[PDB]
Design a protein around this ligand. Structure first.
Ligand SMILES: CCCCCCCCCCC(=O)OC[C@H](COP(=O)(O)O[C@H]1[C@H](O[C@H]2O[C@H](CO)[C@@H](O)[C@H](O)[C@@H]2O)[C@H](O)[C@@H](O)[C@H](O)[C@@H]1O[C@@H]1O[C@H](COC(=O)CCCCCCCCCC)[C@@H](O)[C@H](O)[C@@H]1O)OC(=O)CCCCCCC
Lengths: 621, 518
């Protein structure tokens, strides 16, 4: 049954958490086994769907009624459709490879069992995300992926940076979660259904305003997950966690969650031209800003984070292209899950060889010291750059072709931004690749490397292969589109300008960026001290000041609100009751003074009791 | 015909009577006997729930006897879906709180050696009186027990607590009793109104008859009198279940009282406020509730955000959890007073989930506070290293109070938020921000405590933070188990609650608004 795909890893994680330290010796084996079982199950189901050609290819379980309250009647259903199967395969394969790599990577660390527990929980969460056929289960998987990202990012709790990064990531993801919750509330209040089937069937009757609101809030949720502006700030800091966590989050499951949300809600976006405009704007902004950030990132992890942000921005732009770019967006998302995952595995190998060195400017010449890891990183590098043999090249060409076909000034601006993103990506990817594999040794202390064990090698080699394979395997003949056609809308091939000229321009800009990078470091050197590029470079090392924008407007303002409300509580709410108490006490003292103890004073009060006489006499009038 | 409901509430009180009457030397036997009485009450609850048919009539296990005809009140019990849910909550919690406060009364002196017995008997009396309130279908009987249960907890706070126990106990009792006395004014006004109307044979307190009369329209009364009586009920239920302005007492008491007693106050007793709001305020005063619905909705949402913010600003663990519970009470009241089937059902399930979640989170924090005798958040750090299981359970509890779907509370908050959107979308968004605020005050707290380098005296010295003991494991495991189960499969509890919510919404002339699309 389809639900097994969700059931397997979660149950695994459950044991990995319920068994405790008693499983420290063998837990990793169970975690990797459960991930591999999920991959096998997904492949089997995909084969079954291939057998059920045409219609009826999509699985749909509808296990049980989940929250049958009033008119909600949300059932805990599942839909492994032609779109969902792609994400299932990507997540399972990349996560299994990352688990296998983490075996060696986390071998020396205690709680390796706990780490694999968290990874299996993450895989379960992402699978539930992509497999739910209604937005309630999608939200469940959404928040589950958020929690898993928190837990894994926070691994190595002794590091305050790890804890802070986990907190920031989860809180930004929670802002995204609030956005998605408002989206669901609108969907229910306007349709009364939360299922994909019902929502997408009622969508045509929805007004442009309701659709715009829903699409905008879903795009906000994606920005949360996929780390688009203004919630893009959390991508960089998360790298304080283990390299495999970054790999899984950025390449396959966590980062791609927003792209998946946009693709699945595609019926909403296509029906919300304003929502599509917002999605495109967010994609362009994220792509450009992340590329500029990567232009300065000196830490391998930080540079990879910027690269992931830029790639996710490209995917968001393509998806906001609507049916035109859904197919290319998903194809690039998968090719990315391959090549960026391989890049992260290679970076982890470099760090493990560099005694946990993070700074790219603190090492080099590794291509002559880590040949297999260097080769895997280089394959993922040729993929992300976009060489014609590379997978990423085909996907990026498709995205840019859709952008160009977008027409008008809007399509031209989008295409130019995408081209500039390609150029900047090439520039900083070149800087990184030269800085580690090429260049002077630049070793620190012992820095005595070695090719990571076979357990690490095999996943990295497979990710490199999937970077060389795929992209072409999904773009040649439009097989990916013909697969997504039944469930993902296809409008037409605009053919505004020949694909040849677009591809030539892409290659030219990639080469121009590569040459700029070479003149920067190939002819020049990799200085140990801060290169000090000044201006944007400075602003670029501070993530375009983006964190400060949060720290200034929100953190400072949030603390202002907190202190203000604390004052209100202690002084207004408590103060009113205290003032009433003080009034009662003062009045009690004043009255008690009336008992002077002189019997003649008491008698005077009693004689003034002629108040009674006068009142009774006046009661006649 | 068996007095299932009567025995349900009688057993805790009789058990308290036996316990307090034990010889001081039988302290261990007293603990065990109190736990046994709690478990017996839970078994009674189990049979009552199993025999209860949510597809059947609104009120079941109805027991009726004449108690005080002169006041028009009779000993009438009957459990509906909502009352059944809260009864199950109280019953499942009370034994766990007992095994949580196992040693809470050890370091007390005096009481002729009965401090342990007094603690346990007070806990049992609170449990039984809360049960009597829940299953009472007589307005005056319910008010009796609702007001009286303040006294056992007033003692439980004052004795068996920190230095400010006297002050916090006084503030708690006075706030709550002032509310209860305002509700007494309202109760007497209701009696006068019923006596003044031809719908009843005489001044009546029978809740079912009054509800039937107000629904049938025969009991037609001036909207002004109804407004004032509704306000009288509302003030007491708001101070009990803390609606934003009136919450002020709860932080101090929850801080000062021992963790088991604080949880008994928040998770169980404060719920009775919202319960009353759901049973009486809406079903006695539908027109007044509707008229005041916007203002109370505003107060509840402001309470949500305000409690979240204050919890963020709290340096004290216990104060933070208390304000978190206040925000959750804002959620519950919002969901109850939106008069939407989604809303009311979600707020009932939210009473359940918040009870369990706050119990777990607050008891875990109480264990942590016991390990090192400081309630200040800054006093901790890197506890996750020394006590991995404590940190794991604390994180799970926080996630629960954080409304994460993998756990129960989300299913309810979601339902409430959804409900609020169909009638007050602005308020719904205003409350939804609490999803972010919860992440803030939960994860920041966990970061400050469990993560980072181990603080001084944390893993060493005379005040180390040792991991959870087996007894704490017994306390904690069932709570997280229920959270998981209700998050994954709320279907049984929702199926029980929905018939009662539908009955209530039919009673007050309200219905879930139709979807925008035709
Ligand atoms: C609709 C509502 C939207 C509102 C969302 C925002 C909510 C809260 C804002 C702040 C926050 O969201 O959270 C930061 C602190 C935690 O402060 P911290 O102390 O935990 O971490 C510090 C760190 O110090 C720790 O970290 C180091 C290293 O580990 C250790 O050496 C130290 O010892 C110590 O441990 C370090 O030293 C300090 O310089 C830093 O301030 C560290 O925080 C920093 O916060 C900044 C802001 O964050 C955010 O994401 C903002 C989220 C905004 C999301 C919306 C974006 C636009 C959306 C448009 C639709 C970032 O630049 C980094 O997040 C960085 O991390 O919360 C608080 O104060 C809350 C106080 C009141 C909040 C009330 C809100 C109403």
């Amino acid at each position: 049954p389809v639900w097994l795909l969700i059931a397997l890893p979660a149950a695994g994680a459950t044991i990995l958490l319920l068994a405790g330290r008693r499983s420290d010796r063998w837990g990793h084996l169970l975690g990797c086994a459960m991930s591999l079982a999920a991959f096998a199950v997904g492949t089997v189901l995909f084969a079954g769907m291939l057998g059920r050609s045409g219609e009826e290819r999509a699985v749909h379980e509808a296990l049980f009624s989940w929250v049958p309250v009033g008119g909600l009647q949300v059932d805990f259903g599942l839909q492994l459709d032609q779109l969902s199967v792609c994400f299932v395969l990507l997540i399972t394969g990349v996560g299994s490879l990352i688990h296998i790599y983490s075996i060696g990577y986390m071998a020396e660390d205690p709680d390796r069992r706990r780490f694999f527990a968290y990874l299996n929980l993450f895989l379960a969460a992402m699978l539930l995300l992509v497999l739910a056929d209604n937005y309630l289960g999608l939200y469940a998987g959404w928040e589950g992926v958020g929690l898993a990202s928190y837990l894994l990012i926070g691994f190595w709790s002794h590091k305050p940076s790890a804890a802070t990064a986990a907190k920031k990531a989860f809180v930004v993801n929670r802002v995204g979660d609030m956005g998605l919750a408002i989206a669901l509330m609108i969907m229910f209040a306007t349709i009364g259904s939360i299922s994909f089937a019902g929502v997408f069937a009622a969508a045509p009757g929805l007004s442009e305003a309701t659709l715009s609101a829903i699409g905008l809030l879903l795009l906000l949720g994606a920005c949360g997950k996929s780390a688009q502006v203004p919630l893009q700030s959390w991508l960089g800091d998360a790298m304080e966690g283990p390299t495999p966590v970054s790999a899984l989050i950025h390449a396959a499951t966590m980062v791609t969650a927003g792209v998946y949300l946009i693709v699945r809600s595609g019926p909403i976006f296509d029906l919300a031209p304003t929502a599509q405009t917002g999605v495109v704007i967010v994609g362009a902004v994220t792509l450009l800003f992340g590329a500029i950030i990567g232009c300065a990132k000196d830490d391998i992890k930080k540079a990879l984070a910027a690269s992931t942000m830029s790639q996710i921005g490209y995917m968001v732009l393509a998806a906001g292209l609507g049916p035109a770019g859904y197919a290319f967006a998903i194809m690039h998302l998968l090719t990315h899950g391959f090549f960026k995952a391989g890049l992260f595995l290679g970076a982890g190998s470099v760090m493990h060889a560099m005694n946990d060195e993070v700074n790219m400017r603190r090492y080099g010449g590794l291509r002559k010291v880590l040949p297999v890891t260097f080769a895997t990183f280089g394959l993922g590098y040729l993929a992300i750059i976009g060489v014609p043999p590379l997978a990423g090249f085909f996907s990026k060409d498709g995205i840019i072709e859709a952008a160009l076909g977008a027409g008008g000034a809007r399509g031209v601006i989008l295409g130019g931004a995408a081209i500039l993103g390609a150029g900047i990506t090439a520039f900083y990817m070149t800087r990184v690749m030269l800085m580690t594999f090429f260049g002077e040794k630049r070793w620190a202390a012992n820095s005595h490397p070695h090719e990571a064990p076979a357990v690490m090698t095999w996943p990295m080699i497979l990710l490199a292969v999937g970077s060389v394979v795929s992209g072409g395997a999904l773009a040649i003949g439009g097989t990916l589109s013909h697969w997504l056609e039944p469930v993902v809308g296809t409008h037409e091939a605009h053919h505004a300008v020949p694909v040849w000229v677009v591809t030539a321009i892409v290659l030219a800009v990639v080469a121009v960026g590569i040459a700029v990078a070479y003149r920067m470091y190939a002819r020049q050197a990799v200085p140990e001290e801060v290169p000090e590029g000044s201006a944007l470079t400075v602003a670029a090392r501070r993530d375009l000041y983006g964190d400060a924008f949060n720290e200034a407007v929100f953190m400072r303002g949030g603390q202002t609100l907190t202190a203000a409300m604390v004052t209100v509580d202690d002084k207004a709410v408590d103060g009113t009751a205290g003032g009433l108490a003080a009034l009662v006490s003062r009045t009690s003292d004043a009255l008690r003074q009336v008992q002077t103890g002189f019997a003649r004073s008491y008698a005077l009060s009693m004689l003034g009791g002629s108040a009674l006489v006068v009142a009774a006499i006046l009661a006649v009038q | 015909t068996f007095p299932w409901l009567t025995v349900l509430w009688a057993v805790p009180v009789v058990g308290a009577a036996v316990v307090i009457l034990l010889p001081a030397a039988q302290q261990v036997l007293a603990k065990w006997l109190a736990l046994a009485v709690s478990v017996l009450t839970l078994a009674v609850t189990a049979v009552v729930a199993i025999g209860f048919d949510p597809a059947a009539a609104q009120y079941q296990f109805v027991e009726s006897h004449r108690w005080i005809p002169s006041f028009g009140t009779g000993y009438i019990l009957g459990v509906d879906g909502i009352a059944l849910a809260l009864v199950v909550l109280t019953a499942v919690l009370v034994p766990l709180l007992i095994i949580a406060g196992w040693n809470d009364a050890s370091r007390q002196t005096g009481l002729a050696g009965r401090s342990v017995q007094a603690y346990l008997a007070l806990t049992l009396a609170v449990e039984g009186m809360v049960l009597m309130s829940l299953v009472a279908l007589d307005i005056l009987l319910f008010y009796v027990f609702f007001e009286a249960m303040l006294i056992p907890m007033y003692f439980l706070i004052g004795g068996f607590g920190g230095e400010n126990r006297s002050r916090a106990a006084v503030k708690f009792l006075l706030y709550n009793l002032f509310g209860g006395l305002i509700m007494l004014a309202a109760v007497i006004g209701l009696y006068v109104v019923t006596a003044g109307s031809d719908a009843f044979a005489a001044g009546t307190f029978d809740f079912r008859e009054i509800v039937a009369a107000v629904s049938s329209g025969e009991f037609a009364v001036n909207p002004a009198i109804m407004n004032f009586l509704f306000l009288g009920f509302m003030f007491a239920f708001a101070v009990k279940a803390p609606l934003w302005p009136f919450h002020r007492w709860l932080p101090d008491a929850a801080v000062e009282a021992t963790p088991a007693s604080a949880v008994l106050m928040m998770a169980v007793m404060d719920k009775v406020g919202t319960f009353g709001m759901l049973r009486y305020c809406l079903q006695l005063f539908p027109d007044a509730s509707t008229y005041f619905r916007p203002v109370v909705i505003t107060l509840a949402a402001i309470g949500i955000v305000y409690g979240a913010v204050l919890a963020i600003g709290q340096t004290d663990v216990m104060r933070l959890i208390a304000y978190t519970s206040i925000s959750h009470f804002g959620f519950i009241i919002l969901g109850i007073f939106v008069m939407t089937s989604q809303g009311q059902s979600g707020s009932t399930l939210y009473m359940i989930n918040h009870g369990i979640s706050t119990a777990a989170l607050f008891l875990i924090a109480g264990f942590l506070v016991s390990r090192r005798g400081s309630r200040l958040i800054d006093s901790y750090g890197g506890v996750q290293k020394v006590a991995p299981v404590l940190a794991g359970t604390f994180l799970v509890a926080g996630l629960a109070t954080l409304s994460l779907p993998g756990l129960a509370p989300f299913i309810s908050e979601f339902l409430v938020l959804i409900g609020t959107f169909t009638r007050y979308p602005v308020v719904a968004v205003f409350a939804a921000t609490a999803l972010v605020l919860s992440a803030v005050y939960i994860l920041w707290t966990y970061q400050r405590m469990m993560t980072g380098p181990v603080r001084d005296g944390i893993g060493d010295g005379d005040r180390p933070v040792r991991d959870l003991v087996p007894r704490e494991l017994v306390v904690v495991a069932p709570l997280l188990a229920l959270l998981l189960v209700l998050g994954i499969y709320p279907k049984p509890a929702l199926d029980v609650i929905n018939p009662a919510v539908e009955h209530t919404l039919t009673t007050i002339g309200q219905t879930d608004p139709e979807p925008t699309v035709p």
